[PDB]
Amino acid sequence: TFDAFTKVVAQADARGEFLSDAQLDALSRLVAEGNKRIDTVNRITGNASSIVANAARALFAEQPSLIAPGGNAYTNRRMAACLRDMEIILRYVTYAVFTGDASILDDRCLNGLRETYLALGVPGASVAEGVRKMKDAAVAIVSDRNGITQGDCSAIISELGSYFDKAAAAVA
């Protein structure tokens, strides 16, 4: 996988050149925004259990057929597995925010999930709705101003949002 830093290094080494100032200044920006980045990771993690359960409750409420006898979430074993998947994706998204690159999420989580689901009969489109649920919840948690030093977090929130988007589209 890559860092926001190793990502740039790679692109540069492919050309045998040092980093261009436009590349050095792009990273100095991510460094200065650092605290906001660290706050985003902690806020989602501190609420992970609620982000998952609530996002799951909504899903089943709008798609009852999932929990009707006949599954695919109907057994207790698969209901557990489904909850697990939601936790897994959310965990991998925080990894992306923490490193500042999607490689971690794409390379170890999303890659091959659309097909792994297809081969099992799990409704990938449903998983996409669950991921979107968590995105909104997570975004709102990150946007909350109560109990933090005020500032403009818009960049970090849009980046965060795109990772969730990648998770959705990867199984849509």
């Binding site: 860092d3 830093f5 080494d13 040092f18 980093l19």
Partner: protein
């Protein structure tokens, strides 16, 4: 691709856990460094011509036989010196990457892995490269945290070459 950031997630992932206060302190340490790290990277890159050309001379001066002895693995031809300069340039470049990443990762991935192999096959003396590295180190002009992180890498290679 070893860095604070990748190691924190790798360990977190291998353990199947979300990040916590531990990895956060990791990120704070990373950001407390990145600025000076990126600055040292820009500075070294800015004076690459002097550092490299100044390094090759240190080697030839110290090991004059490399410029008078004939052979595929020596710098007594125009092409011998050309490769010796590129080689030194590779070292410096990758060190700047190590500084941009805040870790030995680019060094490990692009140079170190397979270095002894290359030096033995192509009959390149590890002490030649140690001299170059020592020249770069002494002609840094770098100060503080930029000097310290940049020197840990220069010394990291020297250790690997001895």
């Amino acid at each position: 691709s070893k860095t604070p950031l990748t190691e924190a997630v790798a360990a977190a992932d291998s353990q199947g856990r979300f990040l916590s206060s531990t990895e956060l302190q990791v990120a704070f340490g990373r950001f407390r460094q990145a600025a000076s790290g990126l600055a040292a990277a820009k500075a070294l890159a800015n004076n690459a011509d002097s550092l490299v050309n100044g390094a090759a001379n240190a080697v030839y001066s110290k090991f004059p036989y490399t410029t008078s002895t004939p052979g595929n693995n020596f710098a007594s031809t125009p092409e011998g010196k050309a490769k010796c300069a590129r080689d030194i340039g590779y070292y410096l470049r990758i060190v700047t990457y190590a500084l941009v990443a805040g870790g030995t990762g680019p060094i490990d991935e692009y140079l170190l892995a397979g270095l002894d192999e290359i030096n033995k096959t192509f009959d390149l003396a590890p002490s030649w490269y140690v001299e170059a590295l020592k020249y770069i180190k002494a002609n840094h002009g770098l100060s503080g945290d930029s000097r310290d992180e940049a020197n840990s890498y220069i010394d990291y290679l020297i250790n690997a070459l001895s």
